[PDB]
Every structure is written in C-alpha cells, then in structure tokens.
Chain length 463, copies 4
Amino acid sequence: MKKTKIVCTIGPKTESEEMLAKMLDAGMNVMRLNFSHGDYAEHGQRIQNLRNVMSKTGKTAAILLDTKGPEIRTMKLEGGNDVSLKAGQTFTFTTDKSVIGNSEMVAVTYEGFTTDLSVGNTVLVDDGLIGMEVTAIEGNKVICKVLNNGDLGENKGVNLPGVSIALPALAEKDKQDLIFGCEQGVDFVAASFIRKRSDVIEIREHLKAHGGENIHIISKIENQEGLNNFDEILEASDGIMVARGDLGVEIPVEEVIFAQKMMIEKCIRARKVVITATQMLDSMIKNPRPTRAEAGDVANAILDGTDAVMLSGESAKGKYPLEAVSIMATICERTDRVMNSRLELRITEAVCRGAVETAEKLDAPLIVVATQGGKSARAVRKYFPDATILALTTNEKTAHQLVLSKGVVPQLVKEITSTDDFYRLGKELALQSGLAHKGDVVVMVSGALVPSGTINTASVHVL
Amino acid sequence: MKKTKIVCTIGPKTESEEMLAKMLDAGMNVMRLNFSHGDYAEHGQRIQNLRNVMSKTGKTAAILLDTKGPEIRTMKLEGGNDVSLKAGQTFTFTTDKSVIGNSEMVAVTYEGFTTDLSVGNTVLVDDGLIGMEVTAIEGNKVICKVLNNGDLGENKGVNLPGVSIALPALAEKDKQDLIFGCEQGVDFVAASFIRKRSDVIEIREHLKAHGGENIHIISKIENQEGLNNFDEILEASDGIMVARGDLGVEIPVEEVIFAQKMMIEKCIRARKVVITATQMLDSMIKNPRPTRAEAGDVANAILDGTDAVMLSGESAKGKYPLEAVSIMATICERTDRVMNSRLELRITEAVCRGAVETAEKLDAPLIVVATQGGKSARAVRKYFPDATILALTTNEKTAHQLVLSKGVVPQLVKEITSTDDFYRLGKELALQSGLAHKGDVVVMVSGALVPSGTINTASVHVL
Amino acid sequence: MKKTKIVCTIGPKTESEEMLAKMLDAGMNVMRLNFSHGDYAEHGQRIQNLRNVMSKTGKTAAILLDTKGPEIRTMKLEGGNDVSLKAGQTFTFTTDKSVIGNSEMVAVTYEGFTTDLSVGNTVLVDDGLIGMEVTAIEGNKVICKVLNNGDLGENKGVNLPGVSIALPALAEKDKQDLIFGCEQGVDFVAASFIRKRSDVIEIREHLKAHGGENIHIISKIENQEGLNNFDEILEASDGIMVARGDLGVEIPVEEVIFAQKMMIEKCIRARKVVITATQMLDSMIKNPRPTRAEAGDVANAILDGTDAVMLSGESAKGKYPLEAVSIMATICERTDRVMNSRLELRITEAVCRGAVETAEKLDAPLIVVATQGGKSARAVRKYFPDATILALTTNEKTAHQLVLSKGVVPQLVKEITSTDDFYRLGKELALQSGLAHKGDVVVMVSGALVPSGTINTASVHVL
Amino acid sequence: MKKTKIVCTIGPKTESEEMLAKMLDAGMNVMRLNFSHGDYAEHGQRIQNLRNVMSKTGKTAAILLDTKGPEIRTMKLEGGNDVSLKAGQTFTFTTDKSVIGNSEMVAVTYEGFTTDLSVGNTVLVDDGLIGMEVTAIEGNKVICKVLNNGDLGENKGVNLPGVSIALPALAEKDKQDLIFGCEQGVDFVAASFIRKRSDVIEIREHLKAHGGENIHIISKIENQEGLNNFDEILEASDGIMVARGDLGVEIPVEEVIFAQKMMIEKCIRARKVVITATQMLDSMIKNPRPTRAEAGDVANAILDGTDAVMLSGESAKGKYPLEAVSIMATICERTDRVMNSRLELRITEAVCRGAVETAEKLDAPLIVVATQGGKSARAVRKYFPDATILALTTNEKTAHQLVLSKGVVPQLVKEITSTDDFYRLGKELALQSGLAHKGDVVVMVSGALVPSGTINTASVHVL
C-alpha cells in the first residue's frame, strides 16, 4: 500500500461519521480543520465524529488545526457594487477603515499599509487579479497606478510581493483558536503566513501557556520573507506546509517549483515532516476525475520527497470527495511504488542510516523503531526505506503525530523495559501487524542506556 | 542562456515577419505548422516569412509539419441542436454516415467502429466529456449505456481507451500534406496517432517517394497501443512527441506522468530528440501570465530530460503570444541552470561519454562536434553536458534539425578535409561564436578514418 | 601497539619463567612447542612455567603444540661418510631398510616409495639440494638418473614435487604427543604435512577421543597436494600455517608468493586464523639483527593480511631470542600502522561489516564483542578494523585461542545475562582496559535472542 | 610476454655476441656496465657487441652506464692480517692516509671524516659488520667505542647512518667514465650515492658539456640523506634506482620496505622510470636456481610497481647467467599477469587516463602513442594499462630509452606529419608488430596543434 500520507480538509459534505469512515477506507490519514470558516461547535463536532470512528474501527488518524492567520483585505464599496479599474488610472488605498470605496479609492484593513510599502512596490488585489504600482505615499494613503484592467469587488485579499509586512504573527482570532486547539488535544497546528523565527516562537509560547507544549507546529511558508528566513523557521518548527498557491502570487512564478523542492529537501534532512498543499486536485470540486496536469503535479511532489499531500475544497465542500481521496491514494501508491532509498557526523544518523542499508541488503519488509517523541521514526524515514516503519511508542500524542510521516505505521504499546524485551515484543507485533511474516527479516532500532531521543542500537531478527 | 529548445505553433497573430522576429528574440527555436487547420497558401506564407526573417537576421530556426491525422468523430444532429444524454440511458452509434443524430443515436465517421469494439469497452465522446459502455454490437450499430450526464454536440472527437483501432496510418489529407512538406523542405514531420511500427514505415516510404528521405519523423504517442509498441516505434522513428493531453483521455490518469518520464528516458538513451507537448501554458491564450501549476509542469518536463517544449494555441491564436514564449524561455533557463550531467559497449558511446567527462573535469564551456547527419551531436547531448555543443556540419538539413536538440548550437561550414583542419577551424569558430574565449578549454569530437556517423576521436585544445 | 600476533618457539634458552616473562614483554603472544624434539617432562615444564608467568603477571598467552609429522628420509651410508653423486649417474633408492648406502644406492624409510612414484617423477633429497629423475621402478627399487652434482649425507629429507604421498596423517609418536596435548590442555595443535581433508578429520577424531574437542587445529600447508586441496583443508581446519620453506621445495619457486597470498586471503574470508611461518628471521639464530630481505619478507606477509608471524630456531635455540622477538614486534607495529580496513549475504557478516564501518565513521578506538567460541571476534577482525577488538567471553579456552587473532584483546568475564548488561559491563571493561577513555565512542557487537555463534546486534556508546 | 623490464650487468661470461643474443632471448632488455671494474677497451667492446647483435637481429636494447661513485673505505693493516676488535674497546680512525692499521687504529680514505661526524654518531664498517660509536674527535682522529665483536679486514667500506657526508658528487674517475659514456652514446647513466639535488645537477652539467644532454640520469638512492631529499632528487633526475642493500645498512631495517614502496609510487606519479636493484637473485651467482625468499622479494617489487628489475653479479660473473635471466623473466611474467590498471588537473593526464580507461572498456590489446622524448609513452604507462604500449618515435635515443619503461615496445619511424597520417601508420604498425590483429581495437594517443610533449588527443580504431 501507499507510504505517502493524505491530509483531508473536512467540511459539511464529509463531516458525518459515515463519510469519515469511508474517507479513511479510501486513504485519508489526517483531518485538517480550516479555521478560516466555521465556529467552535462545528469544528468540535468533526473532532468528535472522527474520534468516534477511530475507536469503533480501531483505525488511527491525526487532527490538524489550520489557522486563518492575519491578512490584508480591501473593504466596502459604494452600494456594494463592483467597480471597473482601468490600466493606467490612478487608484488610492487608505488605512481609514471608515471609508466606503469607489473607482478611485478603497480602504484596507491594515493600519501599517502606508508604513510597510515603498514607492515602486507592487500591490496585488484579489489573488493577483489586479496589479498596481505605488507612485506616492502621503498621510494614510498609498497612491498607485493600475497596471491592468480589472473589476474590484468588496473584501478582496491583498498581496505585497517581496515586502516585509509588520502584521502580527497571530490574529486575535488565531489566539483563541489555538486555545481551542489545546482544549481539543489536536495533534498539529498549521500556522499561517510564517515570515520569521519570532513568529514561530510566539506560537510556541502561546501553545505552552495552554497545555499544548506537545502539539507540533507546522509553519506555512507563503511569501518571499518566509522563503528568505526558511532555515531559521524550520529550525524552530516541527514541520512545514508548502503553500504553492500563495507562493504563486508572491514570488516569480518560475521559482515556485524550486521553492517547493528545496523546502522538501531541507525538511527531509532535518527529520521534520513536510506537507505539500493547495492547488492539488481542485478541479474535483466539480468533476469526478482530476485533470492530467493535476495528477502529474501531485505525483511530482511525492517524487520530490513530501511526507504528505493535502486536499482542500475537494474533500471539504466539493461534490466528489470520496473520488478525490481515492484517486489521490491511487496516485500515491503508483508513485511510492517506484521510489528508491536515499542512503546518503552523529551517532543517531550513523545507526539509522546503517539500519536502513542493512534492511535493504537483507530484503527486510519492516523496520521496527522504539520511539518516545517520534524523532527515531522520522530519522529512519529520512532515508526513504523500501521497508515499512513500525513505530512503537507509549506516547499517544506521538502515535497520532507519526500518522503524518511517510511510510510510518504507529503502534501504541505498554512500556518496554529493556532492549531484549523490545526485540521480543517487536517480533510479535511485527507478525500481528501483517506487515511481515514467518521467515522475514526485520531490523529493529532503539536506544539502549541513553536518554530518550537518541538512537544507538540496530538489531536484525528473523520472525 | 537556456539549453532547452522551444517549439512554437504559428498562426494568424504570430505569422507576420515582424512577430516572428520578436518570437525568435524571445526564445523560439522551431516553428510548428498545425495542419489540423489552414490551407497550403497560408502555411506556405508562414514558411516564407520565417525564412525571410532567418536570412535577414542570420538566425537559425527549424520548421516542423504536424499532421492532422486520422480520427473517429461523431456527425450531425437534428436541427444542429445539442442533445442531453442521461446517465443510464441507452445510446447507439452507427457507421451509417447518412444518419442524422438525436438523443438516442448518432453516426460516426469510422466504418470499423463495429469491428474494433467489444462488449464492455468504454467509448469516450468529446475529450472524455461523456463516457459510455458498449452493451451490444449488431450490424452497423454499437449499442451503449451512457455512464454520465452530458450534452452531445455535433462533430465531436471519440476516444476508445485500450482499443487497437484499425484506422489507417495516414488520412488521405495527411498524404497530400506530406507531399506539401516535401515540396517546402520542412525539417520535421510530427506524425499523429502512431500506434505501431508499420505506421512509421508507411510515413517513411511516403516521404521517400517524394524526395523527403532526409526529413525526420517525430512520432506522436497518444494512446495505449502506441505506449505498448513504443520501443519499436522509437526504433523506426527519428524522435517522439509526448502528447500528454491525448494520453490523459486514453490511459489511467496516474500513468501519464510515468509514460512521459519513461518515453523521455528512452529517447535520451537512443540519441533521438523528444518533444513534450500539449497542456503546457494553455491559460496564456487568455491571460498574460501562466498559472503556478503550468509553470511547474513545464519545468518538471525539462527536469525529466526533454529536448524541447511546445506551445500550441498560446502562440498561434492567443492574445499574449510573446509573453508565453518569454516566460517559457525564462522557465527553461531557470531550470536548465540547475541540471547536472549524467555520465552513465560501442566505440561512439565510449568516446562521447569520455569527452563530456573530460570537458567537465577541465571546466570546458564548449564541446565542438563534427557531424554529417547530426548523430554525433545527439550522442554528446545524451550525457547532458554542462558545456554548450557547437555542431559543425556541411549539411543544411542537419543544421536546421539540430536546432531542436537540447543545448546544441549548429553551424554550417565549408567542408573540413582532415582532423587537424577540424581542430584549426573549430578553434576559430569557437572564438567567433562568443561561446568560449581566449584561454578556455574546448573538447573536440569527430570521426577520423571512419565512415560518416561513427565518432572515434576526442581532442582537447586551449583557445 | 601491534595488532599482528607473534608465535615463539620455546627452547632451552627461553624456557625459564624469567625468559618467558621478558618474551611476553617484548611481544610474544603464543608459545609453540616443537615436538620434533624434547621429551614430555621438558615440554610439560615449559607449559608449567608459562602458566606460572601468566598467573603472576595476569597476562594472557596461548600454547600451540606442533607435531613432528610423517617424513621420508634417506638412511645411513658406509662408514657414515658423505658421497658425491654425479649428474647423469644412475642412483637407486630401496625401501629395504636393512641396506647401507653408498654412491650408487641408499635406503629410504617409507615402504610406499615404489608405489607412489612414477617414471618421470622428480626425487629431491636434502631440501632440494639434489634432484633425481625416476627412470624405472622394480620390486623395492626406484632407479633414477641424477640431475645435478651434489654431496649426499646420511638421514636427509626427501621431497617428491607434485606427487601425492600416501603417508599416514599421524606418525605413531604424533598420536601420543596429541594425547599429551589433550592432557595438558593446549589451545592449538599445528598438524604437519596436511595434504587432504581426511588428514584433518583423523586428527580431529583423535583429539575428540581424549577430551580435546575444543582444541583448534592449525593445518600446515607444505606441498602441492595440500595446495590443490586447500579449500577442503581450510573448511575442515580451524586455521592454517603457511610453511613457505617447505613449499619452496615442492612447487615452482615463482608460485610460492601467490600461494601464500591466496591462502592468507582465503583464511581471512573464512574467519579462520592464519600463521606465516619458516624462513622468517632465521639469520638471527646467529646474528643480533636480521637481514633487510628478512625484514621485508615479514612485513609483506603482514600486508598480505596474516593474523600472526612465527619464530622458529631463532627464539628456541638461537643466541638472540629477545632481540628477535623485539625486532619482530617492531616490524609488526611499523607495518600494522599503515594498513587500512577492508569493508568489501548472512546476518552475521552484514552486522559485523556495518559495525566496523560505523566504528571508523565515528573514530571509535574499540569494538567490544561478546563471544562464546570466538567466531564473533574473528568475524569482526575479518575487515581489518582500525579499532582494537575487546572480546568478552566466559570460555577460558576461547580467551586463550583469541590471543592468536590479529588485533584481538580477550577478556574472561562472568557470564552476561542480557544485552543491556553486556553494554554496561563492556563500557566498564572498555575503560578498565586502558584501550578507550572518557568521551570515546565504542561499538558493541553481540547476539540477542539467537543461539550462540550468531551476531545480529550492533550498538554505539560513549564512555 | 612480461611487461616488467630486465637490466642485466654484463661481464666476462656474458660479453660475447653469442651470449648477448641468448640474454636477449631470455628476457634481457638493458645492459648495465658496472664501471667499478673493467677498463675502457673492455666496456667499449661490450657496447660494440650489443650493437652488433641489435643490428643483426633487429632487436632493441638500451645501454646503462653505472658509475662507481664516491666511497669511504678503511685502509691496510699490519702484515695485511685481519684483527679482532672487542665490544667496548677503544678504536680510532685517522684521516692520515700514511698510517698502517692494527687492532687499535686504522686510516680512512676521506679527509672529511673528522668534519662530518659528531660525538654520538655511529660508524659502521664492512656493510655494517662492525658498529662503533664516536666518543671524541680530535685533530685528524675519530675516537670510538666498539659496539660489537668483529674481525676487521683491509679496505672495507664505511657507512655513517643518518649522517650527511660531504663527499663530491663525482670521483675523478667518474668524470672520465661519464665522458666515455657520452663518446659512446649510452642511453642511461646510473649515478651512485645521490644525496641531494645538487649532486644530480652536477652530473647533468658534466654530461651537457660533452654532448650528453639527451642521456637520462638514473639517481641511485642509497642512504638516509638521499631518502630525506628524495622529492627534490626525483624532480631533478630522469629516474631512480632503489639500492635496497645499501639502504639496509644506512636506515632502520624495518623502514627499508616502505622506502622502496614510497619511492616506486612517487616515480610512477612523476612519470619517471624506476629500477629495483641489489640483493635480487644473488644466490644464483653460485646456484642454478634462486631461493624462495629471493623470488618473493622480486615479485613484491613488481607488485609495488617498479618499471624494471636488475641483475648484478649473477649475470656478470656468476656461473648461471642465462638461468638467472630466464627465471627472472618467469617471475616477471607470472607477476605482471595478475596486476590491474590504476585509473585514479592537466590536459595530458586527463587524456592519457581516459585513453587507458577506454582501452580497458573496449578490450583493446594495444595503445599506440606518438612521442618525441618519451614523456607521452611514460604518461600512459603510469596507469598500468592491460594493453601493451607501442611508442612511435623518430628519435633513436628515445627509442632505446623507452626499452626500460614497463610494458612499452618502442618503434623508430619516419616522421609523421599529421594526426590522420599517425592513425594510418599506427594501424599498419599495430598489425606488423603482431601485438594486435584484424578486428582488434587500438587506442591511439598524440598531440595535435601543440608543442612536442603535450598529449591532447585520444582516438579509437579497429584494425
């Protein structure tokens, strides 16, 4: 079966226990809650429904909370009517939130709009529909030249390519949503619009103050500043979400593919999970089959080395959610099938790399790893083993979180008290899992006489 | 500058000499004539305009004739009105060309429709818009069950996934178009819907009977039968066009990416040019910028190893042809920039592989190759050299055809009569080309005391 | 310190406890008792003296009993006077032991002399001093033509190059000497003139009949038949002694070097100990320093990969025994210093090869191995690790025997009852041994949940 | 056939044309004239006889003149009688040449004996037979303590281990012998006791002053100072002779093997010929077969990579000269047979390394090299090609000198005027040589459009 993991955004058409059970059957591994919409009762019910399905079926899934994040948006227009902007005309943005807009001026929600912009910068409105060039800044106004014809509606997103925007790391709504995440015991938080290390630290401190210190932070990289600061963002985060659609509006289009490839590569080296998201199978919101191009896009992200792929509207509100998951899983299995190990100085990396190499040389279908916080399992996954990884842990949070790592099957166990006990138990559970059978070789990895989080032992057993 | 070559379909908005000159400036290397449309005067004028621009500017380009090919199409409907087909209804195709269609039956243009199909086969209509399952075949009728709702218009294409269709290799119109190609001295013919070796042989014999034995045949692989017979098709052809859009309708969608990757890989090994085509930058027919996904699709085809990428409607009839070529070239240069050589038993391969390796070890910016029919230049290109390839030939047809090979700069010369003369002339032309300068190392490859088409000499010179 | 081990033949000048202690100080690892001479009281006293020194100093050494073996020798001559044989003359050997020899005929000790020889065979007398060609065999006579001038003395050795000699595997005296060796608890038996597998088996069955089932048999390869049957001899033996001087008389002289190299390499591959012996430092029987040629010969044997080197007359009866051992150790250390690991499918070899590689990648000075019969320690030594091997065993005989393996330090312990206990103890003993210090990395190898003799675990610890 | 070349010292028993022809038949490649003995008429006659044999048989050989060199020797003793010196006694050397020696004092031939020695230095007499330690130096006396018992004869050699001796590079007799060598057109001069760069330069300037600028200088490395200065000596020389016997007296005995190995490896890297000499087959001066130890020593020198091996007394004055040469050739062929190429930034090394690799990948039995001074042929030999090297040259001296390089067959030709002419001629000569046959692949190496001594072309041809 596939190794790549599937994140599904859950919404009205997929929130019932019946639908969720069918989603898991088709290959869903992680439920994404998009807090751009819905209230707390709605999201809490979805969590309840999934956990009901999990306990009834004994299947394991993880829950990811995806924040709305801070934004720059235009505001209202006279009579609520769209206005037609003409290439070459003058157009003005104002930070005065009380102003109602027309064909010459509109208000924006961000007070720092005048401060952060410079003459010559580009202002993009409505997912890049309309481009403008700043010609002057005076008082609370940014005067611009419209670069292309377009119709401006109300409440449209604004992008400032290449600008360092002094928006807070968290909207006030985001802060309450994170408390809800701690209350609900979510496994991951995907933090929107991460631009710098200090953004991640604030989210870390906020989660810690509400008992969520074990919740993993997935930073969403969406603009050039986040790209420039990627190394420090990754270091402070537990993982990364590559938001291709936002990057497509924020950086030169020919760069987006290499931003994805390099971010995936760096996450792999850092033993941190990476999700490829947005613009995956969007056409399946309306159609029962994806496009050739969409299928290729998904497969190339897997070949790039992503841990997981994500469905958005096509699983949350679209008309063919089950078809989308199913064809996603089919693409995953077809692509995982043809990938090879990557066997390219620390004790943990020496032992994990050697264990994968030993497994391949002995045709081992399974690597068994003892792990407390999941690091051990991710250190083996780094080398793209042909073998499946059976991760044994006493930590429920770790067991849920490892559901997102490529090719990892987590298993919650009663604590193992010695290295020999780990070999005895792992052999039994290897057989019980159906992932290996009598006579198969399995490689077992653990830490002996060391603090948690260090791997220093590799062991080969016949079942 | 980029190494990947760009094929541009030329049409009304790009056929003037002024536009063509701007197309070349932006990165166009090969003009495609799509004989699905236009008459002979129209295509002949485009050839004349390009050759005018070539002689005036001294720039080199190639001309590719892309055949319409044989087809299966539905026919007319009552009153010319679309009809609404309902999932589950019975629907019948008839080979009786005299029948006017309605919501229950329509005629098809192919007499063998009844012969080639079987109960259980899938019939796709209008680029897969409507799917049907054959339930019975009687006389001149194929009775089907409609699988999904759809509106059937007139004269729509029909696809039969996984069926071996006994259509001729060439439509009658194709045969006359090939004579026109010989009359005009085109450099390539892209042959539509190639399914088996004998299809290529017929085209070869037809071209030979009209003085076109030196025209290279690019076989378009569009369905499962062509995939199954790919090895023999490639062997008989001079190159391959990967028609992704057609494959998307003809084979399981998760397979299309690997059909592309494997066909490119095999062409590379066979020293035969490969073009990746269709569904590249289609959105630019209407928009001045492509989508993030389109840009990624193009770049991944380059990383796969394609020689060339192709523009269709976006350069022929679209509103932003120059923008499309320019961003295509930008993607090409950005992607070529980060690719590495591939240095993985015949004398020619031993010498060409060694020459590339020597060039890389000595930081040679240029490999100079003496070639008669172009094979030598393509044998060096096989290893993806960092260095540019300067191909010297007395053969005008070869000089034009090498314009399509990745990273090859062709140069027509007066015949060289000895190996030492080749070193003297190549050094001078190396400097004149501006591709290398005084003090640079260049590696020079040629055949000494051997029949044309064998490479057995490698030589290193300082300019 | 050196890794190559030194076998010293002990005699009158080196048998006292005082001399033995200084021999160990200078680098002696194994005492060889040459049972060609000395009676049981003398050899028993030497064994007692070594064990006294071992108990007093806490040093570990092994005891090797070297059998005389079967021989063919000429007999006596008239008046005990030498005779001069002439090239081309007729000379006859007779199996009649009652015959007194002269310049025309002499007796030999072996009844099968007539049976095993053929017309055309070469008969060599006195370490090849005199060659003869069989011209006829009649009754108890072998008639020969003398091939070269020489002086024949009494009681000279006879060699039959390329002939299969049907001598018994054991002389009658050898059988009693082996029983004495079992009584005394020797660690190795070196069996002279091993020609075939059955010779090794016969010695094994004799030892088993007198409680010597754990004594390792080192087969001495001395002639062409042993070379021809080497693979089966090695398989049946525990180790090999390369007797270069004897081979130099039995096979073409240009082949001896490659016979030594081939045999050493095969022993390494089989994880079986090999000794290089004879014509090592013979000149030091009379001189206090060896020859340039001798020193080079020894060093090249070490570079070939021998486990051990052996002193014969120069440590047993010569005038400079301590100088011989000391310069030998100097050669060993000087040559071992510049040798590298050899890292090249069984579980044991996969784990042991990986453990050596891990040790080298982490600059581990020490590999700790748990072993019962020594196989595990010898499996690590196979890869010529930079690190010293500390072999922990509960088996006293194994501890002695491992003294002969290159780069192994054995240590007798109280049995370890678990894998974690093995790591705790090995770390302590690593520090106690002085072979590693606080902060050093050590790699520990053992078998977990497997029968003795299987290695399936590798573990990395910081001291 | 062997690739390693054989230098034979010619003397009374091997000087006739008849013997020389049989010496060449048996494997001799180079004649060494040891000018320690013989007068000019004798050496001139030997040169004449070899050239007669060469012209009659068409075989190619080289002539090497080996200088006596400077020495320190003791002088005469009272009554010409040996004296016995006692360990611990006082013994004095005096530079007063008029003094007649006895058991307490003897004269030496070198005035600088007092200057170059220091209190604590070791004085060795008679190939290290007797060691003495300087205790004081006063006037023309070196007072020593005898370190070991020994018998002092007259006119014995003196060695000063680790001392820089200020002897002139050339004895007065050496200067005349070198002029004679220039007059006679010898191909090599072997310069004895080279200690430093300036010694090589002095010999060079003498040869240049008498028309010997093309004679190659082989520096004999014989003591520690030469070892210390080896890199600069090699740089200044054309080749090296490793004098193992002399080094065995001057440096620690365990170091001699690695001094030989290091020096051979460095010569290979520098593309300069190396000879292994002294203590090769000395026992064959009296015996018709060598010792096991001698044969092994020679073979290990070949495996180390020496170009040539040298016979001294055993071919010049011994009783079995032809047997010595023959068994030497047998050892050479037996050892060369099992050696492999060594394929490891200049243009010459890139092209030559690639040519060897191409030859091996294509099973080419022959590499043809165009060379003026021999550098090109020696640059190919550096990689130990399986193929034989056919070196085409117009230079008679180069043709002779290349006889000493491993695996090179030189061939004198009429000048080639182009690269294509070189391929035509080399193919013909490849076939004429019997080293390759119809259908074989040959690789041809030369310089095109470059000054002599640059190699920049590699070419592959089928015969």
